[PDB]
Amino acid sequence: MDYMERPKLGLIVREPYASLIVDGRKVWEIRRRKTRHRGPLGIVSGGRLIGQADLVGVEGPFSVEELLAHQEKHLAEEAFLRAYAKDEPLYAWVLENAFRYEKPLHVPRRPGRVMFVDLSEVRW
Amino acid sequence: MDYMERPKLGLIVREPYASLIVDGRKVWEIRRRKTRHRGPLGIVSGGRLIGQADLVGVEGPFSVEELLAHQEKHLAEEAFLRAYAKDEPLYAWVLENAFRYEKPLHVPRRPGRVMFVDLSEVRW
Numbered sequence: 001m002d003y004m005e006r007p008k009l010g011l012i013v014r015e016p017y018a019s020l021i022v023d024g025r026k027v028w029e030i031r032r033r034k035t036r037h038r039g040p041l042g043i044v045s046g047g048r049l050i051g052q053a054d055l056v057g058v059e060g061p062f063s064v065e066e067l068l069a070h071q072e073k074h075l076a077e078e079a080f081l082r083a084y085a086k087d088e089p090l091y092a093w094v095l096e097n098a099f100r101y102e103k104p105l106h107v108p109r110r111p112g113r114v115m116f117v118d119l120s121e122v123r124w
Numbered sequence: 125m126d127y128m129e130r131p132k133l134g135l136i137v138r139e140p141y142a143s144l145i146v147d148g149r150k151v152w153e154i155r156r157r158k159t160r161h162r163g164p165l166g167i168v169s170g171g172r173l174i175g176q177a178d179l180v181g182v183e184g185p186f187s188v189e190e191l192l193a194h195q196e197k198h199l200a201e202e203a204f205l206r207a208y209a210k211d212e213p214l215y216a217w218v219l220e221n222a223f224r225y226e227k228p229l230h231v232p233r234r235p236g237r238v239m240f241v242d243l244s245e246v247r248w
Contacts, residue, residue: 006248009133009160010241034234037132042243049246105246112156114242117134119166120230121238122173124130 001099007052009116010107015118018043019073022051022100028073029094030081034058035093036120043098049105053098060091067092129229131176134166134231135239142167146198146224152197152216154205158182167222171186175230176224184215190247191216226244 013021013029020026035058041110042052064081067074067090074092081090107113135143137153144150146167159182166176188205191198191214196217205214231237 006243006246008242012141018183020138022204032239033232033238035238036159037240042241042246044241049243072197072235090212105245105248107241107243108157114155114157114159115136115169116242117136117162117166117231118132118238118240119130119231120133122166122231123131124229 001097003038006041007042008013009037010044010049014046015045017076018045018050019098019100021053021095022040022098024098026075026081027095027098028059028070030084031091031093032085032088034060034091034121035070035118037118041095044107047107047109048055048098049101049102051098053091053095055072056096058091059094061089062088125221129164131164131166132166133161134173136168139169141200142169142174143224145177145219148222148224150175150197150199151219151222152183152194153219154191154198154200154208155215155217156209156212158184158215158245161240161242168231171231171233173225173231175222175224177219180216180220181218181219182215185213186216187213 037055039054040052041055042049067079084120161179163178164176165179166173188209192202
């Protein structure tokens with residue numbers, strides 16, 4: 001929404017989920033773990049930075065059954081959820097203010113691409 | 125050095141380089157690309173967070189020849205440097221205030237492990 005600042009960190013998201021997020025249709029991003037990161041987060045899909053969203057909270061842990069009660073929030077197929085979770089807990093990263101950039105930006109390809117480990121959940 | 129705050133991001137570094145860094149012997153970390161990240165950075169080796177260092181600057185680009193003039197800063201073997209760089213430019217991430225934690229901390233294993241893409245060099 002016409003911002004001057006850009007996110008410092010990005011998250012790799014596969015289609016169609018990446019698009020659903022930046023197009024503002026998906027406010028819950030499903031992951032196997034929590035994160036304490038808060039604020040803007042770039043959405044990287046197919047090696048291109050297509051947009052961003054603000055990560056404002058994390059809900060969970062959820063069982064697949066509990067997530068199906070929020071189908072409109074994640075738009076994830078039950079078949080894929082179960083095959084993904086593997087009978088284990090899932091979390092939902094809450095997003096808002098998501099938008100798609102006018103032009104997708106290029107992200108450094110592997111292996112030069114710098115990746116950082118999220119240490120926000122480390123037991124200090 | 126008795127800090128209360130901990131780094132939010134970590135970098136995966138292979139031994140013996142990881143140890144050389146946290147033990148304060150290696151102030152230059154060699155990488156294929158630059159980064160604008162500044163401040164504390166956890167050093168992750170073998171799936172364990174062993175310590176941290178402050179990333180305070182980035183030098184480069186360097187040719188292998190130019191780096192050999194700073195052997196004491198990176199402690200990297202010429203043979204490995206050339207085999208790594210592959211006839212391409214390299215950069216040196218400048219580190220300081222590095223120390224090894226009293227006890228190495230566990231980092232979430234794959235594939236649950238959350239990794240973020242460094243977008244600091246993206247051409248906006």
